[PDB]
């Protein structure tokens, strides 16, 4: 009878093992034991992104944001979802919001968020070039 924290830790181990459907299911079990922890949802959202299940990832980002409106990763993963959906202006807005929140929270992700912003703006520009 594992605790919610034990199930999150098992999911994280499976994530290290690149067993993403199994990790996502573990995070679901953690949610069953405590559905009020935003990190369980952003962890699962990242699994769904790795699994190319952007619709399921977006839903988890929304669940996380309801619980933690300041979540950097919820905004970042949401922007990644929107990039795949070709909602470029929304994706850029969420990536800039993740950048702002990470700065406010003194979080260090190297150059990950600016790199994602550059990817998003290039894809937006590429979408313009593909139509003329």
């Amino acid at each position: 009878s594992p605790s919610a924290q034990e199930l999150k830790e098992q999911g994280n181990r499976l994530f290290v093992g690149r067993k993403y459907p199994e990790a996502a299911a573990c995070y679901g079990r953690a949610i069953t034991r405590n559905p009020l922890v935003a990190v369980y949802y952003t962890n699962r959202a990242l699994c769904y992104l790795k699994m190319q299940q952007h619709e399921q990832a977006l839903a988890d980002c929304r669940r996380a944001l309801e619980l933690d409106g300041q979540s950097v990763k919820a905004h970042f993963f949401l922007g990644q979802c929107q990039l795949e959906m070709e909602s470029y202006d929304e994706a850029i807005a969420n990536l800039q919001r993740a950048y702002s929140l990470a700065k406010e929270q003194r979080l260090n992700f190297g150059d990950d968020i600016p790199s994602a912003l550059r990817i998003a703006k290039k894809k937006r520009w590429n979408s313009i070039e593909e139509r003329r």
Binding site: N43, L46, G110, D112
Partner: peptide, 6 residues
């Protein structure tokens, strides 16, 4: 760094 689980 950001594409990691917490």
């Amino acid at each position: 760094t950001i594409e990691e689980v917490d």
